[PDB]
Each structure stands twice: as C-alpha cells, then as structure tokens.
Design a protein around this ligand. Structure first.
Ligand SMILES: *[C@@H]1O[C@H](CO)[C@@H](O[C@@H]2O[C@H](CO)[C@@H](O[C@@H]3O[C@H](CO[C@H]4O[C@H](CO[C@H]5O[C@H](CO)[C@@H](O)[C@H](O)[C@@H]5O)[C@@H](O)[C@H](O[C@H]5O[C@H](CO)[C@@H](O)[C@H](O)[C@@H]5O)[C@@H]4O)[C@@H](O)[C@H](O[C@H]4O[C@H](CO)[C@@H](O)[C@H](O)[C@@H]4O)[C@@H]3O)[C@H](O)[C@H]2NC(C)=O)[C@H](O)[C@H]1NC(C)=O
Ligand SMILES: *[C@@H]1O[C@H](CO)[C@@H](O[C@@H]2O[C@H](CO)[C@@H](O[C@@H]3O[C@H](CO[C@H]4O[C@H](CO)[C@@H](O)[C@H](O[C@H]5O[C@H](CO)[C@@H](O)[C@H](O)[C@@H]5O)[C@@H]4O)[C@@H](O)[C@H](O[C@H]4O[C@H](CO)[C@@H](O)[C@H](O)[C@@H]4O)[C@@H]3O)[C@H](O)[C@H]2NC(C)=O)[C@H](O)[C@H]1NC(C)=O
Ligand SMILES: *[C@@H]1O[C@H](CO)[C@@H](O[C@@H]2O[C@H](CO)[C@@H](O[C@@H]3O[C@H](CO[C@H]4O[C@H](CO)[C@@H](O)[C@H](O)[C@@H]4O)[C@@H](O)[C@H](O[C@H]4O[C@H](CO)[C@@H](O)[C@H](O)[C@@H]4O)[C@@H]3O)[C@H](O)[C@H]2NC(C)=O)[C@H](O)[C@H]1NC(C)=O
Ligand SMILES: *[C@@H]1O[C@H](CO)[C@@H](O[C@@H]2O[C@H](CO)[C@@H](O[C@@H]3O[C@H](CO)[C@@H](O)[C@H](O)[C@@H]3O)[C@H](O)[C@H]2NC(C)=O)[C@H](O)[C@H]1NC(C)=O
Ligand SMILES: *[C@@H]1O[C@H](CO)[C@@H](O[C@@H]2O[C@H](CO)[C@@H](O)[C@H](O)[C@H]2NC(C)=O)[C@H](O)[C@H]1NC(C)=O
Ligand SMILES: *[C@@H]1O[C@H](CO)[C@@H](O)[C@H](O)[C@H]1NC(C)=O
Ligand SMILES: CCCCCCCCCC
Ligand SMILES: CCCCCCCCCC
Ligand SMILES: CCCCCCCCCC
Lengths: 330, 115, 202, 176, 117
C-alpha cells in the first residue's frame, strides 16, 4: 500500500509527457483494439453514422517500468494527463466525445514490464460516403479511418493487435433498416512526398433491407397501374366511367409521389425509386391517352382494335419495363 | 424464458422458443470427456453476422433462419478431437464475452458426436 | 538536452506581445488542404467544409541553437506560445477536434520558424440567390483574417499555388457539382481598423 | 523592444480586477459599437431570431495609461481575463455564445491616453414577440436590449459611440 | 407611437382608449394624482387580458378589464372613499421597460380625467 504509493511516485517522477518513448530510438509500436457497442444511427441526409465503442491503445515504455509488485496495476483516470498518450484522431469524424458520467470513461493500466494500456468509451459521428443512386436497392460501405496527427511512420507505427481479432462487437450491432454483410481491417501508410504517415481503417458493408420498400413504395404503384389497365375492359361509350378511372388513377399516382417525402426528398438526387415512380406515372398517362384516342376515333370522327391491342400490349410492356428495371438495378 | 432444443447427431439444428429477442446472440459449445466446454461459433440475431473459433474454422459453419427452428450448424472433417457433446446456448444483449460459457444463461443439451 | 532546450526557450517571452511588435508587420504564410466540402444545406444557407489549415510565421525570440532543428511542442506549450488570432469571418459554428487527443501540432525550427497546423470542420455561411433555381450556380466563400490585429500589425499571404484539393469524387456534394475554386485577398475597412482578409471561393 | 514588456508589466502590476475605473469618482462612461455580420434566421414558430455581431465597447481607464510608446497596443485576448470589463448583457437573449475558433474571438486594445477597446464576436438568439394577426401582410419590430447586470447609473453609463452611425451592416443584411 | 385618451369620471367606470402601435406597448397602467401628492400606481393590465396587478390600498375595491378587439381598458370602482378624489391617468409601457410602480418607465401618457367624491 505505502510502498505501492512510493512506487507510483517514483514512476511518475522525472517522466516528461513532452518526450515520447524512445525519442531518438526506433519508432514506438501502438497496437489498437476496438470493442464496438453498437452503431446508433445511420442517416443518408447528413451522410454519416454514429458509432459508440471502446478504443484501446497498447504500447511499451521503458520509463514506466517497475518491479517487486507482480499484481497488475490499474491506476485512476486522472493519470492520463500525467502520462504521455499517443496522438490519434479519426480522419472522417464530424463530432465525437468520451462519456463522462459518473466519471470519465478513461482507464490507464500499467504492467511490470513498463507496458501501458489506455481505454476510452467514445461515441463518434463518423462520416461515410453513400451511393444513393441504387437506393433503396443499394449497399453502402462505411469506414472509420484512424490516423496519427503529428508523428510520421519513422516515430510511431500503428498496427492491429491480434490481427483479425482486433475488432469485436459486429455480432452485437443491430441496425433496424441495414444488415451487415462483412467487415474488414486494413493497415497501411499513406505516402506523401514529405514523408509517410501510418493509418488503420475499419470498414463495414451494410446491405439495405428491401421488404419494407417492396411493401410500401413499390406495391401500391403496381396495383394502381393494374387498376388503370381496367379501362380497356369497360365499354367504349362509358365516357364518364373511363375518364374518371384514368384521371383518378393519375391523381392517386401523384398523391403517392408527393407524400413519399419519407423516402429521401430533403436531399435531392435521382435514385431508383424515382425512376420506377416516373415509369408508373407515364404508364397511367398513356392509359388515359389511349381512351382519348378511342373516343375520338370511334365515337366521333366487335371490340375496337385499339382496346383489343391495348389489353395485350399494356401488361406486356409493363412486364418488360419491370424486367429491365429489376435486372439493371440488381 | 428461452427453451432451447438441439438435435442432430453432419447437420445440427437448435430450435428456440420464448422471448428470443431478449437473448439475441446464440452460439455453440462442445465438451469432450474430462474437459471443459469450449466455444465453437456464435451467430447474431439479424442476418449473417457470425464468429468462429480458429481451432475449428472452415470446418464448422453456422447459419440462421427467422423461425422457431432458428440456427443450423454444419460439420465437416470428423476427427478424434470432435468426440464431444455439443450444447446450444443463448446470451443476453449486453452480457459481453462470446467465448465464455458463464455469460450464457439458457442451455440446451448434449449430443455426443463420437467418431 | 531537448528538455533543457524546452525550459530555456520559455524564459522571458511574454506571449501577450506579437513578434516584431514595434518593428514591422508579422507576415504569416497560410496554406489549406480541403479534405472535402460537405453537403450544402441550402435550407439554412450554409455548407460544411473540412480543412487542414496550416500557418507559418517567424519569431526571433524562439531561436535556439542545438543539434535538433525540427523540435515539436505538446499542445500545452502551444498555449504558452504566441499564436496568431486568425478566425473565419463567415463561419456559423466552426470547431476543431479533440478525441482521442487535441488535434493541434506546433513545430519550431532553430531559425525561429514556427508552423501551426489545425484540423477544422467549419459550417460557413453561403447566401444563395435562388431566383434561377433549379438552373442556378453559386460561389460559396470561405474568408478569414486576424480578429484584432490590423494590416499594420499582421499581414497574411498564400504560401504557394492557392490551396490544395483532394480527389473530388470523395467529396460529399450531392445536389451541386464542383466547378473549381479561386483565391482572393483584400483590405476590408472596419471601425477598428484596416484588416487583411483572405478568401477562397468554391 | 523590452521597453514594451516592462511597460505592460508595470501596467498590469498591482491591478485590481474587481474595482471599476474611478470607483469613488463619477460613473464610468462606456461607448458601444455593433457591426451586424448576419441575421441568420427569423423564426415565427419560436418568436426569436439569431444574430451574429461584432460587439465593441470603449471606456477610459486611468490605470492602463502609459507613455513613451507612440502606438496603440493590441495585446493577446487572454489579457481580458486580467483587466476589468463592463458587466454588459443582452436582456432579451435566449441563448448566446462567443465564437472560439481558431482562438477565442475576442480583442483587447489599449491606447496611450488610457482608453480601452474591448471587442467580441457574439452569436445570440434574441426574443421578438410578433403580431401575426395580419400575416403575411404584417410588419414586425424586433429589438435587442443591452443592459448592465450589477451596476447602476450611479456607477456606469452607456452611450452609442458615433451616434446614429454606431450600427453598421444593416443595409448589407438579406433575409428570405 | 400610441395615443391614449381617458374618458368617464358608487359604480364608476373609467375608460382608456389606445390608438396606433398598441402592440409595441402592451402593458397599460392606471395612475392617480391627488392635489399636492405625486403620481401613485393604481393598477396594471397585460396584453392578453390576464395577470392584472393592483396596488395594496385598492387591491379589492377596483377591477381592471381589457378587450383588444377595440383597444380599450376599463377601470371599474365599486366603493369609493374621500381620499380617492384625484386626477386619474392612463399610460402605456414597453415590453422591456422595467417595473410597474414607477411612472418614469411608462412612455406615453394621457391627459387624465378628474374624479371627486
Ligand atoms: C421599435 O419598437 C420600439 C418599442 O419601444 C420603439 O421604441 C421607442 O423608440 C422611440 C424613438 O422612436 C424612443 O423614444 C425616444 O426616447 C429617448 C430616450 O427617452 C428616455 O430618456 C429621456 C431623457 O433623455 C435620455 O437621454 C439623454 C441623452 O440623450 C440623457 O442625458 C438622459 O439622462 C436620458 O438618458 C426621457 O425624457 C424619456 O422619457 C421619460 O422622461 C420624460 C421626461 O419629460 C417623460 O415625459 C416620459 O414619460 C418618460 O418618463 C425616456 O426615459 C428620447 O430622448 C427621445 O426623445 C425624442 O423626442 C424628444 C421630444 O419628445 C426630443 O427632445 C429628443 O431629441 C428626441 O427626438 C425619444 O422619445 C422610445 O423610448 C422607445 N421606447 C422604448 C421602450 O425603447 C422603436 O422606436 C421601434 N423602432 C422601429 C425601428 O420600429
Ligand atoms: C427484461 O429483459 C432482460 C433481458 O434478458 C431480462 O433479464 C434477465 O432477468 C432474469 C430474471 O432474474 C435474470 O435471471 C437471473 O440471474 C441471476 C444472476 O445469475 C448469476 O449470478 C448468480 C449469483 O448467485 C449465479 O448463481 C448464477 O448462476 C446461474 O447461472 C448459470 C449460468 O450458466 C448456471 O449455470 C447456474 O446453474 C445458475 O443457474 C448466475 O451466474 C440469478 O441469481 C437469478 O436467479 C433466480 O432464478 C433462478 C432460476 O429460476 C433461481 O434458481 C434463483 O433462486 C433465483 O430465484 C436468475 O437466474 C437474468 O440474469 C437476466 N439476464 C440479463 C442478461 O441481465 C429481465 O428479466 C427482463 N425483465 C422484465 C421485467 O421484463
Ligand atoms: C469498403 O471500401 C473501401 C474503399 O475501397 C475498401 O478499402 C480497401 O480495402 C482493400 C482490401 O479489401 C485494400 O487493399 C489492400 O491493401 C493491403 C495493404 O497494401 C499494402 O501494400 C501497398 C502496396 O505495397 C502499400 O502501398 C501499402 O502501404 C500497404 O503496405 C494489401 O495487402 C491488400 O492486398 C491485395 O492486393 C495486393 C496487391 O496490392 C496483393 O499482393 C495481396 O495478395 C492482396 O490480393 C489490399 O490491396 C485497400 O487499400 C483499401 N482502401 C482504402 C482506401 O482503405 C474496404 O475494404 C471496403 N470494405 C468492405 C467491407 O467492402
Ligand atoms: C490610435 O488610435 C487613435 C484613435 O483612438 C488613432 O487616431 C485616430 O484616427 C482616426 C482615423 O483612423 C481619426 O478619425 C477620423 O478620421 C477621418 C479621416 O479618416 C477624419 O475625417 C475625422 O475627422 C476623424 O479625424 C481620429 O480622429 C484619430 N484620433 C482620435 C482623436 O480619435 C491613431 O491613429 C491610432 N494609432 C496611433 C499610432 O496613434
Ligand atoms: C496483468 O496483465 C497481464 C497481461 O495479460 C497478465 O498476463 C498474461 O496473462 C495471461 C492470463 O493471465 C496469459 O495468458 C499470458 O500468457 C500472460 N502473458 C502475456 C505476455 O500476456 C497478468 O497475468 C496480469 N497479472 C495478474 C493477473 O496478476
Ligand atoms: C491564388 O493565389 C496564388 C498565391 O497568391 C496566386 O499565385 C494565384 O495566381 C491565385 N489565383 C489562382 C487562380 O490560383
Ligand atoms: C387487370 C385488368 C382487368 C382484368 C379483366 C378480366 C377479364 C376477364 C376475362 C374473362
Ligand atoms: C391528345 C391527342 C389525341 C389524338 C386523338 C386521335 C387523333 C387522330 C387519330 C387519327
Ligand atoms: C418481387 C418484385 C415484383 C415486382 C413487380 C412484379 C410486376 C408483375 C407485373 C404483372
């Protein structure tokens, strides 16, 4: 107890934070581990995802070695300022924090051989590019890039501790709309003309679940188009009925397209859902134009030929359009 | 409140009944005679997100179905080190540690797969 | 060695006063690397931009003769040294990064050259003339200057070749397309005095 | 060159930050100046409006009086924590802050006669009650009220430095 | 600006009618000035018509109402005492003027009616 206190005092005495371990020696090797609690949210509008996690950095330092105390020491969180820590930052971070209730989620653990382990609970809102061109049938690939700020590869070398076992909690992630297909870890050195800087990267591939979209966005449009096709089987002189059917189908299509504001209106890009809705709109418009032709040709100046070929060509053309769309986008 | 029944022995199937959402991650352990239970592979609740032990990688595979039958296991390369009874277990959402049996609450039974 | 140099250089050096307070203006060479221009939030007339901003100046008090000439300082000493009062005029809510550690680097050479680099994520204001919408083009500015020091005290200069831009494909611009950039420098007149305002238009 | 260092050290030596200029004398007279950078939004839902400004205060302090240096000294902004400043505040603000990138957007300037210029960059959300009965044919009157917190007219007085030209940028402001 | 006009003057009802930019000066206050004595704060009423505030002397005797449909404030009196003989004024106050009991904070005053009992 007392001798433990004097051991800690001797360890911290004459230890300059401004000096890295082996200032003139070979570079210090930092092993990084992550235990990710969950990915809290993924927003396409702001183009980013929120990740909470336990970042651990492990490194050796001869200055902080002790002896005669075989048990492993876990010092208080207030020693972080007293001890030197590597400068590490997330390149694609927009806003992150270290939890601070009831106390700061920060741990420093020393070992008798001078080794140090530093752990932090961080919630980072990292930013990842998204290709919402194939939305909602897309498959995003988001990344977290860890990099040293001041030091080059000649002074600090980042690596994954445990190879492919560095990152854990992918099973623990549970996103409502997305589903994780694969995760990857890549360590490398970004090469600059001035020098080389180390970098690590943890990447996730996130497929999107399409059952919800197929139920809400796609199915009503198909049903409305099929309803618009009903006009061809009604008597050609039923002007009020056929015109009301066609124009109300057009109105329903427009109503769906406008209150579809849930599906990414705030940021505007041409996605795949937009093309599908446009195709359905064009089909119902052509359906009404067909009765326009029928009325003018046959009423003014034994089924009529226009309806006869329309009944066969409208479903066939819509099926071909659907086949082309699904094959191209999948 | 998670009744687990494992069957098979090679293909194994572990059916879960009850509040299965509260116990998302489910995995497999094996116990040889005169040995402790050792981890064999775990699978998450949603879709394909699984982990396997290095000692038995690429010879045991785990898949999931959104049904009461729940998870399936596929076995290859029978060896004298596979003479162990295999248990199916489920874990709480926040009970960290896949490889440790003590973190798991509700277990199935043992199926001897002696060569 | 290095530590004795560190405690020697601090002695004296009242940080309140700029280098060459009474002699000549302090010349600051600025460089900027645009990581990416975030989405242009037209609803609030703003756009997010991520930059690595470096500025270099000369301080004769910090001269030290020793075997090392590439010395580096912990962020705490950065706060014991004098640094310029540069700020972005059109920023709405800008902020540097701090996790895992404060992202600020200060490197001093033996000849008194000081280089200070910061990573910034600014949300700069960009008024939009939406009369020609959706057939519109805009020139969003990012302008900065010293807050307190007039032209007679601090003078900014672009280091070389304006600013450097990464690969445009990595940028998060979805509603707009990038059509290049340009740089400008002027002397904006204010009540407090004349100030050298640098600007980069995208 | 060390003369400036000795002068500022002498000025700051034995300086009481809790005592106003002329504590027992007549009240200190403070001029104010504003430059409106932008009126960001004007929300009818919340009946408030955000406003960014350069807010400057001028006051004469005999304690910070020097001689032999014919130039106005612009010191580092951290000296504001050592000098005395007015306890000004916006009475109708709902939320406000001083910008802090790259450093604190603050400025202290001294003059040989003793004048002190104190500038801040402030974004503030002020309350503006609105008579929306005639909406959208309405006309609103949104005010910003500046007042001393603790001191009274027996201790501190306010005025618009430069008179009607004390506020600028209003012609430059644009709103949707 | 606002133009105030007082009228009227034992059930007595005084009426202070306001015209102009009445919204910018929401609070309206009644004062009384007897001969010799200085102005005293009788009462105050808000814009919405609620949260009326009366003085200690006449807290329960008088009652002040409001109706913004015509921009008029009514000051009713139930029982009058012979110390109440005075010139009754109406005034308007800004939204960030200050206290209610001090006539200096009030900007626009009225000519004031006379009451004797
Ligand atoms: C948006 O809406 C707001 C809503 O309020 C609206 O605000 C009003 O704006 C008007 C102007 O349009 C303001 O009116 C002016 O107020 C001046 C200050 O009045 C106070 O101080 C007077 C004394 O002088 C002060 O200043 C001198 C130095 O200049 C100083 O030495 C003094 O010590 C003092 O600080 C004071 O008289 C006045 O009134 C009180 O006292 C008088 C005494 O007779 C009494 O009659 C009053 O009942 C009251 O108790 C007050 O305390 C004022 O100087 C100015 O005067 C003009 O007219 C006079 C003649 O009438 C001229 O002599 C003078 O030169 C000026 O031309 C004027 O009255 C008003 O105060 C605002 N109200 C509030 C609450 O802020 C905005 O205008 C609207 N604007 C927009 C853009 O929409
Ligand atoms: C909301 O949703 C959450 C999500 O899961 C629910 O969470 C769980 O609640 C149940 C309710 O009790 C918890 O059950 C218990 O666990 C405790 C603690 O167990 C540990 O420590 C014990 C210390 O004495 C130890 O004995 C235990 O050993 C057992 O477990 C091991 C596991 O392998 C087993 O091998 C042993 O044989 C033991 O069985 C264990 O290490 C335990 O004390 C509780 O005991 C009660 O129930 C048992 C069985 O009926 C009974 O015998 C006891 O006498 C006692 O009455 C109980 O088993 C569970 O741990 C929670 N899970 C998590 C992950 O937190 C929650 O219940 C839901 N609530 C609501 C309101 O919806
Ligand atoms: C989401 O999308 C991102 C962006 O594309 C993907 O990121 C890339 O991932 C791949 C691997 O999946 C990375 O490629 C790898 O780099 C490794 C290290 O390169 C070293 O070697 C080079 C050349 O010598 C050095 O310059 C560098 O500094 C390193 O020292 C390679 O070892 C990998 O190997 C494959 O190619 C090499 C040839 O180069 C073969 O010899 C190998 O046998 C092997 O076949 C690979 O090349 C790539 O660098 C990553 N890019 C970025 C920007 O991070 C994510 O993977 C993706 N995620 C998902 C889940 O899809
Ligand atoms: C230190 O500060 C003083 C001011 O406190 C500086 O002197 C002042 O300079 C301004 C101009 O920058 C003078 O203002 C006006 O100038 C216009 C012309 O530009 C003129 O038309 C007006 O009549 C007016 O003079 C101001 O009067 C003057 N001083 C005063 C009395 O305010 C001074 O230059 C600064 N620097 C030094 C080194 O002293
Ligand atoms: C202090 O921490 C060290 C770090 O692991 C512990 O040491 C190792 O201990 C584990 C399990 O106890 C072994 O599997 C490793 O082989 C050990 N060596 C290395 C290099 O990791 C150590 O036991 C801890 N001290 C205690 C428990 O008193
Ligand atoms: C930008 O600034 C640099 C440096 O001052 C200058 O050389 C160049 O001409 C300017 N314009 C462009 C378009 O780069
Ligand atoms: C979906 C288009 C309308 C279906 C008409 C059914 C015709 C039945 C012919 C026997
Ligand atoms: C809207 C166009 C309708 C055209 C009706 C038919 C034109 C004449 C066909 C011979
Ligand atoms: C499962 C996806 C179905 C896509 C629509 C099918 C169209 C059928 C046309 C009659």
């Amino acid at each position: 107890m007392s001798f433990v206190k004097e051991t800690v005092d001797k360890l911290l005495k004459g230890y300059d934070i401004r000096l890295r371990p082996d200032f003139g020696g070979p570079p210090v090797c930092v092993g990084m581990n992550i235990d990710i609690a969950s990915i809290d949210m993924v927003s396409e509008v702001n183009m980013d995802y929120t990740l909470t996690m336990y970042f651990q950095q492990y490194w050796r330092d001869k200055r902080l070695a002790y002896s005669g105390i075989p048990l492993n020491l876990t010092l208080d969180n207030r020693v972080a300022d007293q001890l030197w820590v590597p400068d590490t930052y997330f390149l694609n971070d927009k806003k992150s924090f270290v939890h601070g209730v009831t106390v700061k989620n920060r741990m420093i653990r020393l070992h008798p051989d001078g080794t140090v382990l530093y752990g932090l609970r961080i919630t980072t809102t990292a930013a990842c590019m998204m290709d919402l061109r194939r939305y909602p049938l897309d498959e995003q690939n988001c990344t977290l890039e860890i990099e040293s700020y001041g030091y080059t590869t000649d002074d600090i070398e980042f690596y994954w501790r445990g190879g492919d076992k560095a990152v854990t909690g992918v099973e623990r992630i549970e996103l409502p709309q997305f589903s994780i297909v694969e995760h990857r870890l890549v360590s490398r050195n970004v090469v600059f003309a001035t020098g080389a800087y180390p970098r690590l990267s943890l990447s996730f591939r996130l497929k999107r679940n399409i059952g919800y979209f197929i139920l809400q966005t796609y199915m009503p449009s198909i049903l409305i188009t099929i309803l618009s096709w009903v006009s061809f089987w009604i008597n050609y002189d039923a002007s009020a009925a056929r015109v009301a059917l066609g124009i109300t189908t057009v109105l329903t299509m427009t109503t769906i397209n406008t209150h579809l504001r849930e599906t990414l209106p705030k940021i505007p890009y041409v996605k795949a859902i937009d093309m599908y809705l446009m195709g359905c709109f064009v089909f119902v418009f052509l359906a009404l134009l067909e009765y326009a032709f029928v009325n003018y040709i046959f009423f003014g100046r034994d089924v009529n030929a226009i309806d006869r070929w329309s009944r066969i060509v409208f479903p066939f053309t819509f099926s071909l359009f659907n086949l082309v769309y699904w094959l191209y986008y999948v | 409140q998670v009744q687990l029944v494992e069957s098979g022995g090679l293909r194994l199937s572990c059916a879960a009944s009850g509040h299965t959402f509260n116990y998302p991650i489910m995995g497999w352990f094996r116990q040889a005679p005169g040995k402790e239970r050792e981890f064999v592979g775990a699978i998450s609740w949603s879709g394909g997100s699984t982990s396997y032990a290095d000692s038995v990688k690429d010879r045991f595979t785990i898949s999931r179905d959104n049904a009461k039958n729940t998870v399936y296991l596929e076995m290859n390369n029978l060896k004298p080190e596979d003479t162990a009874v295999y248990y199916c277990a489920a874990k709480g959402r926040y009970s960290g540690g896949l490889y440790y049996p003590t973190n798991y609450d509700y277990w199935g039974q043992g199926t001897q797969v002696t060569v | 060695d290095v530590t004795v140099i560190l405690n020697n250089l601090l002695e004296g050096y009242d940080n309140k006063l700029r280098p060459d307070i009474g002699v000549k203006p302090t010349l600051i060479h600025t460089d900027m690397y645009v990581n990416s221009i975030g989405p242009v939030n037209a609803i609030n007339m703003e756009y997010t931009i991520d930059i690595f901003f470096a500025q270099t100046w000369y301080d004769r008090r910090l001269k030290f003769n020793s075997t090392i000439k590439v010395l580096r300082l912990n962020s705490n000493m950065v706060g014991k040294i004098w640094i310029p009062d540069t700020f972005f005029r059109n920023s709405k809510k800008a902020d540097a990064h701090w996790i895992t550690t404060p992202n600020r680097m200060l490197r001093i050479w033996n000849d008194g050259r000081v280089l200070y680099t910061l990573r910034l994520t600014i949300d700069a204001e960009c008024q939009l003339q939406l009369h020609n919408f959706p057939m519109d083009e805009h020139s969003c500015p990012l302008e900065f200057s010293s807050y307190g020091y007039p032209r007679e005290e601090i003078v900014y200069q672009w280091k070389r070749s304006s600013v450097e831009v990464g690969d445009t494909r990595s940028w998060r611009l979805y509603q707009f397309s990038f059509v290049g950039l340009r740089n400008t420098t002027e002397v904006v007149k204010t009540t407090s005095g004349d100030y050298v305002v640098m600007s980069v238009y995208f």
